[PDB]
C-alpha cells in the first residue's frame, strides 16, 4: 500500500511496507450469501433437487 | 530658473496573471505598467459586463 498526494511540483509519494496473505479453510468466512441456489457445483458432488 | 511640471500618471500596459499552483490555480494578480508623477495613486475598476 502506498499513499500518494499532490506534492509541491506535481506529486508526492509516501509508501508503506508490503504484506502477504493467503486464503484457506482456516480463514474465517462471513459468507453473507447464504444458500438455496439451484444446481450446486462444488468439490463435494453434483446434486440436483 | 528652469523647471518642469509633473507628469500625469497614465496606464501604459496592464495585465493580470495567476500563478500556476500544483493543487488548482493560484489567485490572479493584475500587473500594470504606468508612467507619470504623483505622490500617491488611486486605481479603480468598473466591470464591463
TrEMBL record, chain A:
The lineage of its organism: Viruses, Duplodnaviria, Heunggongvirae, Uroviricota, Caudoviricetes. This is Central straight fiber.
Amino acid at each position: 500500500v502506498s499513499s500518494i498526494a499532490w506534492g509541491p511540483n506535481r506529486q508526492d509519494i509516501t509508501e508503506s511496507a508490503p504484506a502477504t496473505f493467503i486464503l484457506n479453510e482456516d480463514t474465517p468466512l462471513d459468507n453473507s450469501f447464504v444458500n438455496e441456489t439451484g444446481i450446486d457445483v462444488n468439490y463435494a458432488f453434483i446434486k440436483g433437487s | 530658473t528652469n523647471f518642469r511640471t509633473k507628469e500625469k500618471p497614465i496606464i501604459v500596459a496592464a495585465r493580470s496573471e495567476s500563478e500556476p499552483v500544483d493543487v488548482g490555480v493560484g489567485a490572479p494578480i493584475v500587473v500594470v505598467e504606468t508612467t507619470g508623477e504623483a505622490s500617491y495613486c488611486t486605481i479603480e475598476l468598473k466591470s464591463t459586463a
